[PDB]
Amino acid sequence: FPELYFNVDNGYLEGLVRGLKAGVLSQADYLNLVQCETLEDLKLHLQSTDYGNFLANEASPLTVSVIDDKLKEKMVVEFRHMRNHAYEPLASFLDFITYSYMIDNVILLITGTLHQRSIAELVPKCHPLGSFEQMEAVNIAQTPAELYNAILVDTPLAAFFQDCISEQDLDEMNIEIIRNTLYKAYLESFYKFCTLLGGTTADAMCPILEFEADRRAFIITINSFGTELSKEDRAKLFPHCGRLYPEGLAQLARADDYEQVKNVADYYPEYKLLFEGAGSNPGDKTLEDRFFEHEVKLNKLAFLNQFHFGVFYAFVKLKEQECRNIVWIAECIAQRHRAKIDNYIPIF
Template identity: 40%
Template sequence: MDLDDMNIKIMRNTLYKAYLEDFYRFCQKLGGATAEIMSDLLAFEADRRAVNITITCCLCFPSFNLCFLGWFVLLWKNALLINPSLISYRMERVRCLTRKEIYEEEVKKNCLAFEQQFHYVVFFAYMRLREQEIRNLMWISECVAQHQKSRVHDSVVFIF
């Protein structure tokens, strides 16, 4: 197999899919509040990845081709044949389409993990919130480096 950028992305997405599915099964085995809360967080992550991959695929299609929408509909129908659970796709999870709104939704879900007791989700949520802090710092440093201090609040997602 040729290890070009596309194959690496496919490999990365396939590995991440396997990781999410294995981690989901592990959380289900734990049961209780951990399974309940992690199911929601992992489903949100899976939905976000599915939407990002679908949008990325659509961006790869030439806009001048006559069957642009037709191919997208065909791809979606084939995805439904492969994974019928997409039919019950919860649209409220995908109502936010901007990157900032998706991150804000993720932060809300991770903050909710701290409202229950006696589960392991707080460790996962803590790490995800730390990742958001790092994204915030990266955005702020990029704005400062590019002399765009007025845009700092455009993508900063506030935690707590």
């Protein structure tokens, strides 16, 4: 079915983004990167891979903060040059990728207004993959209630606010409860959208989004125990998509200590392995590190089917991991803490 028509609109971009997947640091590239001893050597290694010339015409006193900004500049330009060429089905799907970054921008805007800060102070700090198309909210910047109305007009996120949040809630909620209730609605809507693009998109994409929902339920649960969050607040923040939805979420809402979270994970052999693969001892990979490795295993495996949108989400989450990896290696090299340099996550 979908193979016949998919290359009519997306087949160029499917080829372009697979071209950009060949443009990643291999395990051998990371094993070359960690050998060297200064940020100038990172420049010489990245000069030899597909990142060539990215750091030419820049300040000779390099900093790890420049490496982070330049890797974001590479990632955003590669994404914009796809979104500008994508037609409506994919273009809506790519906008669902951008919506994750938009949530982390709009929460800064609201936080700024709740602390009387002008939005123009936060514009340079917003993720460029979550950048706004309409600027009337940015230009007005007057009050939290004015911004709420201006978000509903200007921002694609408007529906997620209307499902979960009034302006009065934004005066009373913690900003991290706000971010998570938006991400709940975002995942549930984006998972529904991916199942409306049924077949090879859902069959490669839903395994990732179901893992994002399951990972959130685990990590939100184990982190909530040291906090004022009630059983009901955990239940309200969990995404309903993942394998845990029938009962795992209920048992995690009942949980209050890490042993009960492992007892949920013990029912699913994947999650049993993630917990049993990390004690979080000194020099160990932490529980969240095992989840970041599995998120990458899923996003690699989404490239195994030539006719679907799974590659664009997977490409972005793997380029994000590649930016996380190159920055971490650059930190170990610049700070001389080479002991943990092997804690990057391999990709392909």
